[PDB]
Structure 1
Amino acid sequence: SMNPPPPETSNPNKPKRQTNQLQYLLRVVLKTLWKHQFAWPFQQPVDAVKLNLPDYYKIIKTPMDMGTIKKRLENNYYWNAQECIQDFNTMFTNCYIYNKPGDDIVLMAEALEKLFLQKINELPTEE
């Protein structure tokens, strides 16, 4: 079995910014979800070898996880908040696509997504 290369977290060709919204995405949004009891399956790319999921990357072609998001935020990979928000939504959508309704992992994603929505609802206006 083989995992794909992880999503990139560094690209010197890519223009970068540090905006107040991106600071909020790290200091509030990521930190809230990262410390949650249900964060652990989402803190790194899905390891299809260790978890014995040989079809995972046959099904999921745009992988995303909070370890990648954390690195992107800490290394100022993004230009805007919408890129980061899209990464979180990709992570949740992948989980709902691959897994079955009512699975433990889906209940975990739902709890994290609820908090995500609560925090993004108060995303600050851009400075």
Structure 2
Amino acid sequence: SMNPPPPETSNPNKPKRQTNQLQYLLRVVLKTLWKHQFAWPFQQPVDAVKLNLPDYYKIIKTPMDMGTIKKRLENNYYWNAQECIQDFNTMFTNCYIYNKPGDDIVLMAEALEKLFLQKINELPTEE
């Protein structure tokens, strides 16, 4: 019956960079998954109150979504590509932990994770 604070997308005392690899994570990886027919459940934080999922955040202590990831990239929040790659991996893992194999939401996540993997495979070497 209440959502937590969302993940921070802004922290002025966190040091930041805008690397070639971070630019690809935006213009290639996030863009690819964002436009997908299965992106919609992943485009903002889990609204456990409207979804009637009052255990979600009992179970899920590290929430992540592509709304967050997107703001983080657009805001220049990260130091490196690995922090961002972690965030996508977290989002996928959380889906798997909470739900049961073969639920529509897990197949959605599986499809996006496949594209994620195809895109990251070609992550450029730093400039």
TM exceeds 0.5?
A: yes
Give how far 1:52 is off.
0.1
List per-residue Cα deviations over 1:33-86 (Å, max 9, x = no partner).
000000000000000000000000000000000000000000000000000000
C-alpha distance in 1 between matches for 2:21 and 2:50: 36
Q: What residue ranges of structure 1 are gaps of 5+ in the alignment?
A: none
1:10 maps to what in 2?
10
Displacement of 1:17 after TM fit? 0.1
- Equivalence map 1:1-127=2 (5 Å): 1-127=1-127
Separation (CA, whole Å) in 1 of partners of 2:62 and 2:53: 16
Q: What's the % identity of the aligned pairs?
A: 100
How high is the TM-score relative to the length of structure 1?
A: 1.00
Q: 1:5-50 CA distances to partner (integer Å, 9 max, x unpaired)?
A: 0000000010000000000000000000000000000000000000
Q: CA deviation at 1:118?
A: 0.1
TM-score, with length taken from structure 2: 1.00
Q: State the Cα deviation string for residues 77-124 of structure 1 (Å, max 9, x = none).
A: 000000000000000000000000000000000000000000000000
Q: Secondary structure at the match of 2:26?
A: helix
Structure 2 unaligned runs (5+)? none
